[PDB]
Amino acid sequence: TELLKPRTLADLIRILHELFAGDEVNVEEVQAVLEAYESNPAEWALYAKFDQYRYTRNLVDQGNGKFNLMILCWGEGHGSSIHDHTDSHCFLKLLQGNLKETLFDWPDKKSNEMIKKSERTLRENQCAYINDSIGLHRVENVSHTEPAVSLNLYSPPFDTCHAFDQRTGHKNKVTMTFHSKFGIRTP
Template sequence: MAVALNLIAWRSQMNRRRLMAQHVATEQLTITDWVQGLAAIPGRDFTLENVQDYIIRHSARPETLDKYCYFSKGNYTRNLIFKNEVFECMTICWEIGQASRIHNHRDQNCWMSAPIGRLKVQNFRVDDRDSARGTCRIVPTDIYEMDAAHPAHVNPLEPVHQVLNLAEFHQRAVSIHIYSKPFDTCEVYLREKGTYGDVPLHYTSQYGKLDPAEKLL
């Protein structure tokens, strides 16, 4: 019952914040200044609410993201912009029709915005988890769209989701993701098989430089 009430409260709060984002005057910054503003938030104040308020009130100018935009038809790309002990910030670049796997966030906070294009975010609930067997049941819950006017954050009570650039959107997308604290593995869930497991994470590029091992298609 308590979890259900907390979920209702979170959904209500998220709806209020999405409405707020439509009416708040957003200051447009270069990506460098935008990240510097994030880095100026003291670690003790780097909370879900404070960072969400920051990305509602400040947006990154799309034309300043070019250095951190690498696209590949093989898969979406993860491009590191900034990293310290408190948080990391990256772009994720999506060709038309690409989607992430269903994944978690290692109990860390995650915020997202999409200055270019739009994305669909599907949340899931994990039921019947058996860690010994690596099995579980994944149940779809909330679904919403994210674009330049509608930043979002991951629900700590349901931190498993999938991000999709649907073919019907007819355009590439670039999203900015903030993770606090940084993590280098996550759990990936195979809904059809009812299984899950750890997967290592890597960057396609770091600080604007492509990983030499990457082969973009």
């Protein structure tokens, strides 16, 4: 239960393996360790594979089945849909740049516009946390000049979720694909 400062990304991954050795998750401890890792671009450059047209998901570690650790690359103006997290824990740590996170309530089954509950600006090295009980979110790089890179951890791993239409609240099931795995482009 002894949380030390990750010296490197590899060190963080080792610590993560220990934290997720069990059946449950100490959210605050995982968030603290993610936040404590000081982004060193040389260590994660391998995974930082950008696409011109949308943000990419780049698998770093499969956490021995307990979590997916991945690097997301957000080009200028790239954003996500409004989405849930399939009953998983979801951690987002900024490695480079800034991201806007917008929170939404779960829609009522009446077709109505989804109005923002709140929004915040995630800054370099900060780690955000979300789960379905907290709400739905959209994450966007609103910068015109700076690409953003985040380190994301989802537990349990999931490869499907729901996208929500902001104007009705209607949801559609989406399958997530990885742009790369372990540094390898996977079309």
